Design an enzyme around this catalytic site. Structure first.
Site, mmCIF file in Angstrom:
data_model
loop_
_atom_site.group_PDB
_atom_site.id
_atom_site.type_symbol
_atom_site.label_atom_id
_atom_site.label_comp_id
_atom_site.label_asym_id
_atom_site.label_seq_id
_atom_site.Cartn_x
_atom_site.Cartn_y
_atom_site.Cartn_z
ATOM 1 N N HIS A 194 0.777 -1.261 0.000
ATOM 2 C CA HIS A 194 0.000 0.000 0.000
ATOM 3 C C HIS A 194 0.806 1.307 0.000
ATOM 4 O O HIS A 194 0.285 2.380 0.370
ATOM 5 C CB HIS A 194 -0.978 0.032 1.154
ATOM 6 C CG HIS A 194 -1.782 -1.207 1.272
ATOM 7 N ND1 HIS A 194 -1.398 -2.248 2.088
ATOM 8 C CD2 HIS A 194 -2.929 -1.592 0.657
ATOM 9 C CE1 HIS A 194 -2.284 -3.223 1.981
ATOM 10 N NE2 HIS A 194 -3.222 -2.850 1.124
HETATM 11 C C1 LIG Z 1 -12.184 -16.355 8.157
HETATM 12 C C2 LIG Z 1 -12.731 -15.279 7.238
HETATM 13 C C3 LIG Z 1 -11.964 -14.310 6.691
HETATM 14 C C4 LIG Z 1 -10.498 -14.122 7.059
HETATM 15 C C5 LIG Z 1 -12.662 -13.370 5.835
HETATM 16 C C6 LIG Z 1 -12.112 -12.295 5.301
HETATM 17 C C7 LIG Z 1 -12.940 -11.441 4.483
HETATM 18 C C8 LIG Z 1 -12.406 -10.308 4.085
HETATM 19 C C9 LIG Z 1 -13.075 -9.273 3.240
HETATM 20 O O1 LIG Z 1 -14.387 -9.704 2.907
HETATM 21 C C10 LIG Z 1 -15.305 -8.964 3.739
HETATM 22 C C11 LIG Z 1 -12.242 -8.970 1.956
HETATM 23 C C12 LIG Z 1 -12.116 -10.229 1.049
HETATM 24 C C13 LIG Z 1 -12.829 -7.799 1.124
HETATM 25 O O2 LIG Z 1 -13.123 -6.655 2.007
HETATM 26 C C14 LIG Z 1 -14.533 -6.261 1.874
HETATM 27 C C15 LIG Z 1 -11.842 -7.375 -0.006
HETATM 28 C C16 LIG Z 1 -12.425 -6.148 -0.800
HETATM 29 C C17 LIG Z 1 -10.425 -7.083 0.529
HETATM 30 C C18 LIG Z 1 -9.672 -6.391 -0.562
HETATM 31 C C19 LIG Z 1 -8.161 -6.508 -0.551
HETATM 32 O O3 LIG Z 1 -7.589 -7.632 -1.156
HETATM 33 C C20 LIG Z 1 -6.202 -7.795 -1.215
HETATM 34 C C21 LIG Z 1 -5.673 -8.923 -1.804
HETATM 35 O O4 LIG Z 1 -6.577 -9.891 -2.333
HETATM 36 C C22 LIG Z 1 -4.308 -9.129 -1.875
HETATM 37 O O5 LIG Z 1 -3.765 -10.355 -2.470
HETATM 38 C C23 LIG Z 1 -2.790 -10.130 -3.541
HETATM 39 C C24 LIG Z 1 -3.456 -8.189 -1.369
HETATM 40 C C25 LIG Z 1 -3.953 -7.013 -0.763
HETATM 41 O O6 LIG Z 1 -3.014 -6.032 -0.246
HETATM 42 C C26 LIG Z 1 -2.349 -5.405 -1.393
HETATM 43 C C27 LIG Z 1 -5.369 -6.813 -0.668
HETATM 44 C C28 LIG Z 1 -5.943 -5.668 -0.047
HETATM 45 O O7 LIG Z 1 -5.215 -4.793 0.446
HETATM 46 C C29 LIG Z 1 -7.350 -5.520 0.014
HETATM 47 C C30 LIG Z 1 -7.958 -4.288 0.680
HETATM 48 S S1 FES Z 2 1.851 -0.755 2.834
HETATM 49 FE FE1 FES Z 2 0.068 -1.782 3.579
HETATM 50 S S2 FES Z 2 0.884 -3.507 4.639
HETATM 51 FE FE2 FES Z 2 2.657 -2.375 3.971
#
Ligand SMILES: C/C=C(C)/C=C/C=C/[C@H](OC)[C@@H](C)[C@@H](OC)[C@@H](C)CCc1oc2c(O)c(OC)cc(OC)c2c(=O)c1C
Ligand code: FES
Ligand code: HEM
Ligand code: HEM
Ligand code: HEM
Ligand code: HEM
Ligand code: HEM
Ligand SMILES: C/C=C(C)/C=C/C=C/[C@H](OC)[C@@H](C)[C@@H](OC)[C@@H](C)CCc1oc2c(O)c(OC)cc(OC)c2c(=O)c1C
Ligand code: FES
Lengths: 428, 256, 179, 428, 256, 179
Positions: free
Chosen positions: F144
């Site tokens: 980020h």
């Molecule tokens: C046991 C249950 C669990 C742990 C559930 C978790 C659910 C989480 C959320 O769902 C609500 C989530 C999926 C959703 O937020 C609404 C997404 C928009 C999140 C978006 C998201 O993705 C990333 C990603 O995919 C990455 O990989 C390469 C790397 C990342 O950093 C660079 C991110 C990242 O910075 C973000 C904000």
């Molecule tokens: S810049 Fe977001 S985890 Fe490092």
């Protein structure tokens, strides 16, 4: 199709929600269904089964979060769940004895049905759906047991996939496909994991229809006499609303059951299981004392009664030009023992519903009950005399009861006088 | 077949209020280390559990010291090293010696009467009791039957059941006439083969009784936890039942 | 009639064809993986095999028995009249498919000392207990009570055939090569 | 609530089955529900979604039969599913692009809703349930992506479990618990497998209620005008039975979609994904080009727009005595971007349903649409100028639209004349 | 961050009707074995796939022979042996040399224009094409910039993008000025380092182009299978669509 | 009133108590198991660490950076006024908890040569890129956009704190012992 009263929106939140999606309405009509005033303790098994299905599923998801389905880690993984995972040792044992309670319940539930004619029309669908649920339960219960990858896990996996090898012709194919190879190995364990997970949701789905079915048919009582469907007045004379009259009764019963269940899980968690499954799976040795899970014993007894030298096996083998030999006969005998029970609605020809009023029936029934207990007991002895005989007569009486006795009693037997109404029996 | 005799020992942990004896386990651990360990491993038992409560409960510094006596192969490096207490006791040294990790649970000592499992319901599976007997089961002289017909390399055992038996000891049908059979495990114990710090007797009777309580725990570490869990569940439910009962009774009261 | 009643078939038809093409692979994926199918053959060392000893080896995930039989063992094998056997076929992949269950025909050698067979009970799959055990001085399957004789022939129980003999052959004085 | 006739048992098997369990009856009333005659291609996304949910679930169970959830075998296991498992290579790709199609569909589905006021009463429940389904979909889609255990898998796993670390106070706990340890490791992968499995069944359950809800409210049309509910006669003028009029239209659409979908899966299966996930997970290196899955980009853009030096972030940090800093603000900003959309039924104050008749709304709407595409596009650029600005204005317009614009248009804007009947519109 | 230039080679398999060249793959396999294999491994590629259809397609006897050069450690025994074709190519010999199993898939050579990915949509992800460039991208002389400031143990590469660059080749903001950067992989090819049986030229241009097609296949063995699957799905659906269309049209005909 | 209205509470109450006792273990099982909590400390060999080099080591499943800084690296670290840094705490577990983010306070030696910190971006977790990259001659978190300076202090982006320094100390001339 009983006469009661329907949902009436009270608060604002209720009027708002109702004009959009009547979830509250339907849940009401479900929890308020009028049910017979007389209903003995034998009607609580339906609930104990529901609870078990829920207990199993949550403790399951939880255990699936720590278990690894792979031959090299599988057994170790479960010992880890036992020693490391926070409270794993008690979750594992709950899931295990949960299977046992699940069956003790489904059998008590089943026999309750055989006796009170709960399978007799119009409840014929409740019965078949319940029958499917039963089949699924075993299929599941089986795959589960394979997962720890112990001695019983491995060989029971070998033997049960073997039953499909018995099918003439296609059989070798059906088996290679189930195994994903030339032998029970990782490929098998892995697919069994995926299915052990999936099946319970399918059961859950059926339990919905099972419920839907008896709900849209009204419950049965120990009398066999239906509830008077001609006026909200006399209908209320025979019934009482499910909630809270029976939910408290059921929950109360469910507490006493669980009391004993936890007593087992806490003090003798290993009583109902096989010590040989604490031995890692060995592909080159079959434990000398390999025995099935108790809830499988009866159908196991029946399968091994029929050996090469049983007169009727011999005849069949003869008139079948060889196709139906001893092996495949025991397979057909076992599955048939279940299929025969699924057809009871069409073999019991007596028009009298409750067997409380069938003095002749009562006797063959309790013999059936004693037979099941005996069958179970025999599955655990060796194949030497006199067990081979006991097992034979027992298997025999099983089909005797469904295929001959019940059809005959239907015509012979002189029925007793059944109360004219639930009301008059309850007040008694 | 395989349904023989096992010495009922009155272990401290048998019982709903049973509990391990912190010292037995300690002794047992010494026997396992000084005698058994020679051939049998415990591959599913993490050394650090020795510190965990409800068991031998040794202080980390000792446990850390103990674990030093093993030559582990580090998974990342691949080269050998000292044993950390985060390591599992090694595998069985002697290739045909079974692992003792779960051994106290993988054997039954009480087989129901009529094959009705009612003997097990009242005496437990008897796994420790069985391991006990197998240790205190090497008699000085073979049964008169086997005289001269003894398989070389095996030893008669009064409790072991799945061993081979000389042709001369089977009756008319093949069934063996001896109470036990022949194991490949030369009798392990012999009075005072281990000297307990506090002088507690090292009679093959005691030693065997201790390694058992230890082997019981090696297999069931959460025994006490489980039992406490038991109680709790029973109280919650003995109450909830009584209450749910009254709520029931004092509700149908307005009908029947 | 109409050619519209045809379309409503040419359609529902092409539909059912796709659905099938979908269902097939969902089934076929369960069949043996390209690696399970890649398993070939193995070589076993019988140097230490003393007569009276059974060697159990893993091959294709199932156990394979290698017993060097005693005289007693060969005695009984040869004393059984073919028609007293439950299975008459040799079940031996080395010889013709129609051979007869004669001990002489179930061994690798002429001396009939080397019995090599799949320790896979033909009933439902267990590995029958050896050590000259059972009612016929052979093997006993603990799963459902099948007895096999000193030549590995079924003689009592649910098992319908004799233990099969896999493609085997000595490729030198101390080594057999299964598969 | 649209006037129509019902199912009645024709054959005997039907009269038999009906008096016991009306599965046939209910299935009829469901497949025959009258729906508006005018319904453009934007109404087919509901089906494409249903299909995807099924496609994902079956290809999933299948894949679960070969995948092992354990850090040391997990990645290898998927490469095995690719090279060895019969047709695995094509099942893997189908499950993967299935996720993409699943989202492209849910977004088209969602925007269709925002424009036609499908969220506006009485359909307020359909909307919330659909909103829950949306949340579950992502939670699922996330855990799935963790399973191959590649570079993106590992770090996205690190970052997403990190969002919970942002929660003030409890946050460090919520995170340790999710991870089952001090870092994303096996314990995590393992529990994620168990949940990735479980969630889809929960989605399936909601989709049941989602359907039940819009079924007991009647569908919405591009007009916003309801179906005349005063006579089977004029009702039929506005409607047409779902079956076969719309099932054929929907299935036909579904075929064209799948045509393109298979074109992708067969010819460019790797287009929609990140090359870095074919690199085994490395706990000591974060790929320099780590980017989220496209369907997550927009909410990702919004989260990283808000850095330490954004005016509100500071204003916020100040008034909030430090508690709400840059990190936790982005978290609140992202989740809030979704929560804001879940509340549209209570922010859009205009009583005019279809936005086809709101000339002022039509403009802010298409800006929202363009914003979402822009937002998505930005998530994929670096944080350098001018992207940091574009991302900012974009995030800004998002809340602007739901929190300010919609409430205001409700009072200002002069609506247009909406047809008096669906009929009048269809005939046109 | 990053993003550089990659030579757009016209591979035989590029295209919806693309197919591997059985011989290229064969040649490539030779280059991988005689040059790359020295440091890189292919641990996800089972040697027996060399026989599998849709690739090099060598006959089992050869494949079996080939697999012999490798010294594998048998999992059951623990001791070394000849390599069976049921074995996976070894791990990378040189510890910091990446595995080549999935390289043509784990790399992008065509990065969308405005960061819109429209360049990738029309040219593929260009992984083989990138590996191609990295091989044919070792110039003899570093760019005058880095003269003397050449990190030691590294070599300039015109296509590599994630390497270190001398301070002297970074502009006012830190951005590098050099088209490529510094790799740790000494240029492995040099004209005719390998002799193909049939004499086919071994120009570093051809060799690099071949090992690429091979490395493409090593990563995507079911490339052809996938594409055939593609067609089929499209025909089934182009038909089912046309029919479902008419069924639709000739049904609403009875309304509008 | 009634004592019956009490029972219907003493009941529903005891009920809710059990349900809770049930729900807790179902949640608690997800917390760190006894195997993870047993992790202790490690020892690192810094023999080869030339100045200008970063050593990345795993510890507790997270990466731990060990940079032997150049003069240039130490120059810039020391040239920044504490009041110019975003995070002011040293986040150093070795020195006092109230210490200040002064380059001298964030290195292990007094020479400022040995910078030992968690290579775990404080924003959401990534391992920031090294080898003097970023806009402050430190580390850049690609996830980020957080920039850290030659002392590992956050100077730009969502990251709210400086990379933490873990309990570390040289236990001889060539070995640091983290944890
Ligand atoms: C046991 C249950 C669990 C742990 C559930 C978790 C659910 C989480 C959320 O769902 C609500 C989530 C999926 C959703 O937020 C609404 C997404 C928009 C999140 C978006 C998201 O993705 C990333 C990603 O995919 C990455 O990989 C390469 C790397 C990342 O950093 C660079 C991110 C990242 O910075 C973000 C904000
Ligand atoms: S810049 Fe977001 S985890 Fe490092
Ligand atoms: C139909 C309800 C179910 C029944 C009757 C059932 C039964 C069983 C049985 C008999 C075992 C083997 C006992 C043993 O461990 O020795 C088992 C194991 C297991 N089951 Fe289930 N199960 C059910 C549902 C589930 C569900 C829904 C899941 C998946 C969410 C699950 C996951 C597991 C796992 C992971 C194991 C292996 C670990 C263990 O040994 O307990 N089970 N189950
Ligand atoms: C998933 C396990 C099962 C659950 C949770 C379940 C649950 C129930 C419940 C709650 C009832 C109503 C209360 C009662 O009368 O006991 C019921 C009734 C019944 N069940 Fe089951 N059941 C299960 C399995 C079975 C099986 C295996 C059969 C036998 C095939 C079966 C046959 C019946 C019958 C015949 C009735 C009587 C219905 C009536 O009175 O009209 N059920 N079941
Ligand atoms: C699992 C994915 C989903 C499935 C299977 C699903 C399915 C459907 C179906 C079949 C319809 C009717 C046909 C159509 O209008 O396309 C529908 C309508 C609708 N869906 Fe969904 N949906 C899903 C997700 C969502 C989401 C994520 C939202 C918004 C958060 C949503 C909001 C709506 C609304 C507002 C309607 C209109 C209902 C009415 O006209 O009363 N759905 N959906
Ligand atoms: C809610 C529908 C579902 C969605 C949106 C979904 C999504 C995903 C995603 C994005 C991946 C990563 C695929 C890749 O790029 O390699 C994945 C993997 C996986 N999914 Fe699902 N999934 C769904 C349902 C299921 C179900 C029902 C199962 C059965 C447990 C399942 C089992 C798996 C497995 C085993 C993997 C790992 C191997 C692989 O596919 O690469 N998924 N899923
Ligand atoms: C023609 C045979 C070879 C091919 C196709 C090949 C290909 C590659 C590729 C594609 C990379 C990674 C580029 C990237 O990260 O984008 C690489 C890296 C590397 N190769 Fe090779 N290589 C070959 C021969 C060699 C040889 C003979 C050695 C050992 C002398 C070697 C040592 C390395 C090393 C150490 C790296 C890491 C470089 C770095 O990332 O800084 N390569 N090679
Ligand atoms: C994907 C594959 C699937 C779904 C296969 C499903 C099969 C499903 C059946 O249920 C429908 C089946 C479990 C059910 O047959 C009615 C049981 C009563 C089988 C009875 C059974 O158990 C044994 C067992 O447990 C053992 O343990 C050590 C050992 C056994 O021999 C030694 C047996 C055994 O000999 C038999 C007949
Ligand atoms: S499998 Fe051998 S007796 Fe049944």
């Amino acid at each position: 199709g009983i006469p009661h009263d329907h949902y009436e929106p009270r608060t604002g939140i209720e009027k708002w929600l109702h004009s959009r999606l009547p979830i509250v309405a339907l849940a009401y009509d479900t929890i308020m269904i009028p049910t017979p005033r007389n209903l003995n303790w034998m009607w609580i098994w339906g609930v104990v089964l529901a609870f078990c299905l829920v207990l199993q599923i949550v403790t399951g998801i939880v255990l699936a979060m720590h278990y690894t389905p792979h031959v090299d880690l599988a057994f170790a993984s479960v010992e880890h769940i036992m020693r490391n995972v926070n409270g794993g040792f008690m979750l594992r044992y709950l899931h295990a004895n949960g299977a046992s309670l699940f069956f003790i319940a489904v059998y008590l539930h089943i026999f309750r049905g055989l006796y009170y004619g709960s399978y007799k029309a119009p409840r014929e669908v409740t019965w078949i759906v319940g029958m499917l649920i039963y089949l699924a339960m075993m299929a599941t219960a089986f795959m589960g047991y394979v997962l720890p990858w112990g001695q019983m896990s491995f060989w029971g996996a070998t033997v049960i996939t073997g039953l499909f090898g018995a099918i003439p012709g296609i059989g070798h194919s059906i088996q290679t496909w189930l195994l994903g190879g030339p032998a029970v190995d990782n490929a098998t364990l892995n697919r069994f994991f995926s299915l052990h997970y999936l099946l319970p949701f399918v059961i859950a789905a059926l339990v919905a229809i099972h419920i839907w079915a008896f709900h849209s048919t009204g419950n049965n009582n120990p009398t066999g006499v239906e509830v008077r469907r001609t006026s909200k007045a006399e209908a209320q004379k025979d019934t009482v609303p499910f909630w809270p009259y029976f939910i408290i009764k059921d929950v109360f019963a469910l507490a006493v059951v669980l009391l004993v269940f936890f007593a087992i899980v806490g003090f003798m968690p290993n009583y109902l299981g096989h010590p040989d499954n604490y031995i890692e799976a060995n592909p080159l040795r079959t434990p000398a004392h390999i025995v099935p899970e108790w809830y499988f014993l009866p159908f196991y007894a029946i399968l091994r009664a029929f050996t090469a030298d049983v007169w009727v096996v011999q005849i069949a083998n003869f008139i079948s030009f060889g196709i139906i030999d001893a092996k495949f006969f025991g397979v057909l005998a076992m599955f048939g023992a279940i299929l025969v029970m699924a057809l009871v609605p069409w073999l019991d020809t007596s028009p009298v519903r409750s067997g409380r009023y069938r003095p002749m029936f009562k006797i063959y029934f309790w013999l059936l009950a004693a037979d099941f207990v005996i069958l179970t007991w025999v599955g655990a002895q060796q194949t030497t005399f006199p067990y081979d005989w006991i097992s034979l007569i027992a298997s025999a009486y099983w089909f005797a009861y469904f295929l001959v006795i019940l059809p005959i009693l239907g015509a012979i037997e002189k029925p007793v006088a059944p109360p004219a109404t639930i009301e008059e029996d309850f007040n008694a | 077949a395989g349904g023989g005799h096992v010495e009922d020992v009155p272990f401290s942990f048998e019982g709903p209020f049973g509990t391990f004896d912190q010292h037995q386990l300690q002794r047992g651990l010494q026997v396992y280390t000084e005698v058994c360990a020679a051939c049998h491993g415990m591959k599913f038992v993490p050394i650090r559990s020795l510190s965990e409560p409800g068991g031998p409960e040794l202080p980390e510094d000792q446990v850390r010291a103990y674990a030093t006596q093993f030559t582990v192969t580090d998974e990342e490096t691949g080269e050998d090293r000292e044993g950390k207490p985060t390591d599992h006791f090694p595998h069985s040294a002697l290739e045909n010696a079974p692992d003792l990790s779960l051994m106290a649970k993988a054997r039954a000592g009480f087989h129901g009467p009529m094959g009705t499992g009612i003997s097990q319901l009242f005496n437990g599976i008897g796994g420790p009791e069985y391991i006990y007997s197998v240790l205190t089961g090497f008699p000085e002289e073979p049964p008169k039957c086997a005289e001269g017909h003894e398989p070389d390399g095996f030893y008669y055992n009064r409790a072991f059941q799945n061993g081979s038996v000389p042709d001369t000891c089977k009756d008319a049908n093949g069934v063996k006439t001896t109470a036990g059979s022949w194991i490949a495990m030369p009798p392990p114990l012999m009075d005072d083969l281990v000297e307990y710090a506090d002088g507690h007797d090292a009679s093959v009777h005691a030693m065997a009784e201790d390694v058992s309580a230890f082997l019981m725990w090696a297999a069931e570490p959460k025994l006490m936890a489980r039992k406490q869990a038991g109680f709790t569940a029973v109280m919650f439910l003995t109450v909830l039942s009584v209450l749910l009962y009254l709520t029931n009774k004092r509700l149908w009261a307005g009908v029947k | 009639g109409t050619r519209r009643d045809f379309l409503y078939y040419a359609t529902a038809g092409a539909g059912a064809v796709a659905t099938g093409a979908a269902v097939w692979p969902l089934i076929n994926q369960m069949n043996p993986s390209a690696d399970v199918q890649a398993l070939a053959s193995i070589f076993v060392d019988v140097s230490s095999v003393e007569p009276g000893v059974q060697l159990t080896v893993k091959f294709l995930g199932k156990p394979i028995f290698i017993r060097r039989r005693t005289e007693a063992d060969i005695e009984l094998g040869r004393s059984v009249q073919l028609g007293q056997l439950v299975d008459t076929n040799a079940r031996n992949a080395n010889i013709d498919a129609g051979a007869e269950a004669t001990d002489q025909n179930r061994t690798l050698d002429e001396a009939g000392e080397w019995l090599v067979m799949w320790g896979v009970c033909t009933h439902l799959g267990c590995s029958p207990i050896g050590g000259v055990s059972g009612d016929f001085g052979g093997w006993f399957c603990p799963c459902h009570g099948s007895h096999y004789d000193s030549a590995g022939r079924i003689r009592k129980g649910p098992a319908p055939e004799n233990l099969p003999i896999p493609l085997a052959k000595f490729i030198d004085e101390t080594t057999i090569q299964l598969g």
